[PDB]
């Protein structure tokens, strides 16, 4: 009477296709850094070394914008004492 | 596509309609109406020296 419900997400994988064409293994390319290397090298076994995988980039959090002075005159038009014909 | 079709011994799964290669070029196709697996070879080319 019990079941499990999960939600799909737009993620990239690396799927290992057998000789018979079936999928025997997979690697989630954002699970951990080791799987990022595995998806970068397109391999399931990585050799000893240092491998560049991605780009860290700090994202901006805020936005920040002379003393706003000179708005034009209407108060002398719309709130004027007297108009013309 | 364009190519030579030959009989092939590649075992597809019962939902896969065409094979592919590690260049992502289609080098096999299951035909419909008989579900045989057919290889695809490029039509033979080369220079003339």
């Amino acid at each position: 009477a019990a079941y499990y419900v999960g939600y799909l997400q737009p993620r990239t994988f690396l799927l290992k296709y057998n000789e018979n064409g079936t999928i025997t293994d997979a690697v989630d390319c954002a699970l951990d850094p080791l799987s990022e290397t595995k998806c970068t090298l397109k391999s399931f076994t990585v050799e000893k070394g240092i491998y560049q995988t991605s780009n860290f980039r700090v994202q901006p959090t805020e936005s920040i914008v002379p003393n706003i002075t000179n708005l034009c005159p209407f108060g002398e038009v719309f709130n004027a004492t007297r108009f013309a014909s | 596509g364009t190519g030579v079709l030959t009989e092939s011994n590649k075992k597809f799964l019962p939902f896969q309609q065409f094979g592919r290669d590690i260049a992502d070029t289609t080098d096999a196709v299951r035909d419909p109406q008989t579900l045989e697996i057919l290889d695809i070879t490029p039509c033979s080319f080369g220079g003339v020296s």
Binding site: T12, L14, Y17, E19, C39 | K10, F15, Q16, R20
Partner: peptide, 24 residues
């Protein structure tokens, strides 16, 4: 309730035969 979903739920995405390959 929650449960870990270990490595489970991978499906064939495209109905393409591929033999002895690692497709991303």
């Amino acid at each position: 309730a929650y449960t870990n979903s270990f490595t489970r739920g991978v499906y064939y995405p495209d109905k393409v035969f591929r033999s002895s390959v690692l497709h991303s």
